[PDB]
Write a protein that binds this ligand. Structure first.
Ligand SMILES: CCC[NH2+][C@@H](CC[C@@H]([NH3+])C(=O)O)C[C@H]1O[C@@H](n2cnc3c(N)ncnc32)[C@H](O)[C@@H]1O
Ligand SMILES: [Zn+2]
Ligand SMILES: [Zn+2]
Ligand SMILES: [Zn+2]
Length: 237
């Protein structure tokens, strides 16, 4: 840590956070949420064989790589034949990676791995206010008017854009790299689409977590990229 760092639980205490933010030891306040909030409310089984007690004890994985739901990018429900053992309920169970929020040299705050993160594993859900096209139009205008530095929008599906500017979780801090170590994936949980960050390589402990952030934004000048990669393209857009 060339700058200060904090752990995800530090964001649960809003009085101590606002006091840490005063000292520059934590990022500016936002409303911490556990699940997406719709600004305007909107109007089955895999074939995995139930693991036995012995297989469970023996260390076998329930609803692993071959799970049909997993391949469909659908999380299992409580009715999964593997029930409580099911490893394919990661969003629902908040089975997030061990990550810290850190102050970077030039990009603001960021996320780093607090221990080694295996390749192709779940990091964090990207939570926020879900906007329709009209709300999105309005927020784009407001954030431009207010001269906000950072963007926190992520497209989810037609007529659904997540905005983590005001409400979100620590995933809002993920920075862009031209040579990233994470990607987004859109998963269906009880018929509703959600989006999360997943590693694309083994991320060693202490490394910043990054993705390809390609959200379009108007600006008098383009936004220069500070990712530091050999192949850095120079700009976020
Ligand atoms: C969907 C998740 C969006 N995350 C935010 C992170 C904000 C966080 N840094 C904060 O302090 O709250 C993105 C923003 O961080 C900045 N940023 C990200 N990577 C770069 C980069 N490589 N070069 C320069 N600027 C960058 C930039 O302003 C961008 O809009
Ligand atoms: Zn399964
Ligand atoms: Zn399952
Ligand atoms: Zn770059």
């Amino acid at each position: 840590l060339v700058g200060p760092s904090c752990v995800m639980d530090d964001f649960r205490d809003p009085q101590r956070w606002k006091e840490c933010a005063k000292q520059g030891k934590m990022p500016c306040y936002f409303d911490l949420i556990e699940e997406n909030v719709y600004l305007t409310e909107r109007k089955m089984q895999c074939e995995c064989t139930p693991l036995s007690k012995d297989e469970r004890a023996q260390g076998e994985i329930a609803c692993g790589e071959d799970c049909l739901n997993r391949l469909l990018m659908i999380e299992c429900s409580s009715r999964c034949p593997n029930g409580d053992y099911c490893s394919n309920r990661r969003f629902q169970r908040k089975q997030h990676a061990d990550v810290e929020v850190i102050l970077t040299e030039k990009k603001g705050w960021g996320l780093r791995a607090a221990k080694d993160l295996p390749s192709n594993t779940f990091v964090l859900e990207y939570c926020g206010e879900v906007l329709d096209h009209k709300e999105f139009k309005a927020r784009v205008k407001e954030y431009a008017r207010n001269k906000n530095i950072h963007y926190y929008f992520m497209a989810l599906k037609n007529d659904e854009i997540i905005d983590a500017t005001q409400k979100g979780n620590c995933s809002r801090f993920m920075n862009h790299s031209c040579e990233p170590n994470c990607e987004t994936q859109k998963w269906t949980v009880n018929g509703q689409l959600r989006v999360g960050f997943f590693t694309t390589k083994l991320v060693p402990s202490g490394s910043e977590l990054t993705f390809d952030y390609q959200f379009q934004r108007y600006g008098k000048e383009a936004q220069k990229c500070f990712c530091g990669s050999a192949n850095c393209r120079g700009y976020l857009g």
